[PDB]
Backbone:
């Protein structure tokens, strides 16, 4: 292998793929990038076995070939090279030689034949999804995905279509067992009837990162075993979580009749204030709801109390309900306009939060005893 | 105790003092702020036993008195109160808790008695010495990176602040070393500094003083004794113990007669060191010859990095090793485009000087790569 490539091109590709590589990874080849030179392109692949990121850059290829080399180290070297440098990559020592200006690096390689192969058999045809739309699906819901390390059905984003309101919707649902987030859009042409898949948490994160540099649309492919996002030259192919996502429709309350509307910014500030008396990781807040008012109370585990009254629009029966303060603030953080609407049943039942300026989202909070 | 105080004033004081409080403490009272109300002022004190920060703000005092309350919690509450809120503090009720009320919010915080709060004595201090704030900032920022980060009460874990008579002119000087490298910065001694005993100011004290310098005025007042140092920043003050020990005779470590003198482009050199060090505890080899330094790094897993850097030198060739981070740290302090290095043999301390600041000196200790 022998080629020359512009620093900016090399850096752009390296930066895109190297994100998947775990810092704390133990199998040496999974710390590497597969470099594949052919024609007028250098291809770049990295993986953590669950997902693979690929990217391509233009290069002047004197001799085609394939090698693997340490990903973060290669990225860091190139980052530190002078602006505008042309970079020579040469594989008669067995190391990859990187030369630019008056710098020369020799990096140990591992054989390209030991690098894992992510198969894309079985995928649907490409479905073009508006990029901003996809970004909204993710940003409205991903906070509710569980951060646990397991391969449990809660540790990813359930992407599926539903036939509702005279329209098929492309819908994303996240839950960690404590709260739920739902966001949807009109189903793009070709998405209607995709199989429902649970996209892993890390895959969503990496896809969302790549979306920051994407064009007008992102191509999506789906099978029951895989998902693929294409962002022009870059692509992310991932396994999906094997199992049955819960019947979340059973959790999302339809009939909650105690409806309350409030000033979301003022309420969120009040919740945040009263929650300040606790330095504890988990902080519960009591909402004493009555006509015209919510009285918020937080207590810590060292005798401290905080109370705040917030005027709200409500004229039903009084009741008291508790929520994890962070989960409540997370919901208020998603609301796009000045009001939030809450729908309650009894203090033991799930609570619905709706956004009057976005009918395409739903949030569910599960109550607790403080 | 009963008073009202403007949120901005309360927040400014709380923000100044609460920084000293350790996130974890085994003694509960050390997590607290001492609030002392009298006249037209609320006084604020916090401590970690090594040092104390105090501050005062204007307040309307209905009933004077003293109490202690959790510091970070109080700070966070006030920070989240609405802009322009007047804040009521009441040791009121019959409830034993401090009551903080503002707008439609009410907090009750557990208190500990003011009589159990530690007392930092400032007996024996010199008179106040006014130091230009930017000058003090320079003394610190030029040297503090070289203070050891160890938890011990060893003479290396702080900044040696002292005066020297050099060439018949008295300088206020700061020296830091961690045993691997050294930093020195100095200024003309402000009026009153001439007789100060040399003191070793603890690393955390320097950090906290330097933080308060960010919001200070044109000058900072310094006071010194062999047991204590005090920095005054208007209404706020930081009083600290000093490290009890004999700072080394660092003049013996700072080479005077190193004859192999080399000048280079500091930015280009630093970028090159940073490049080659990428593959690496991390040592770099400098192969010095007329016109050039060849930089080499190897790791313990077959990786090699080499870069040639043009330099101004016409002496004998030699090879010398440094910790790459320590070298980059020095290049980070150099104020203009060139750095000057003075070498003796590969086993000897190396001097780095800044052509646009004669008031600093850096020493690097070589190593075998």
Residues:
């Amino acid at each position: 292998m022998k080629l020359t490539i512009e620093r900016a091109a090399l850096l752009k590709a390296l930066g895109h793929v190297q994100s998947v590589v775990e810092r704390r990874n133990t199998i040496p080849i999974l710390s590497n990038i597969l470099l594949s030179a052919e024609g007028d392109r250098l291809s770049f692949s990295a993986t953590d076995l669950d997902m693979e990121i690929i990217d391509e850059g233009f290069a002047q290829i004197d001799v085609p070939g394939q090698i693997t080399a340490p990903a973060h180290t290669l990225y860091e070297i190139v980052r530190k090279l002078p602006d505008g440098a042309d970079v020579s990559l040469s594989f008669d020592d067995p190391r990859l030689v990187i030369q630019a200006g008056r710098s020369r690096f020799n990096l140990p390689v591992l054989p390209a034949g030991d690098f894992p192969v992510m198969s894309s058999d079985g995928l649907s045809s490409r479905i073009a999804v508006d990029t901003n739309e996809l970004i909204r699906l993710i940003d409205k819901t991903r906070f509710a995905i569980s951060t646990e390390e397991t391969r449990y059905y809660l540790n990813g984003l359930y992407v599926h279509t539903v036939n509702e309101g005279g329209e098929t919707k492309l819908r994303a649902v996240a839950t960690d067992g404590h709260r739920l987030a739902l966001a949807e859009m009109p189903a793009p042409e070709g998405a209607v009837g995709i199989p429902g898949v649970i996209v892993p948490r890390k895959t969503i994160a990496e896809a969302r990162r790549l979306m920051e540099s994407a064009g007008e649309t992102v191509d999506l492919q789906v099978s029951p075993q895989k998902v693929r996002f294409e962002f022009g030259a870059a692509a992310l192919t991932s396994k999906v979580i094997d199992g049955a996502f819960p019947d979340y429709m059973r959790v999302i309350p339809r009939d909650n009749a105690k409806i309350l509307t409030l000033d979301n910014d003022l309420f969120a500030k009040a919740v945040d204030r009263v929650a300040t008396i606790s330095a504890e990781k988990s902080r519960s807040v009591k909402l004493a709801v009555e006509p015209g008012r919510i009285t918020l109370t937080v207590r810590n585990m060292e005798a401290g109390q905080a109370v705040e009254e917030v005027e709200v629009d409500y004229d039903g029966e009084p009741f008291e309900i508790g929520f994890n303060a962070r989960y409540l603030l997370d919901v208020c953080g998603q609301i796009a306009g000045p009001q939030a609407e809450f729908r309650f049943a009894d203090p033991a039942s799930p609570t619905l939060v709706v956004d009057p300026v976005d009918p395409g989202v739903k949030y569910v909070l599960m109550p607790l005893r403080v």
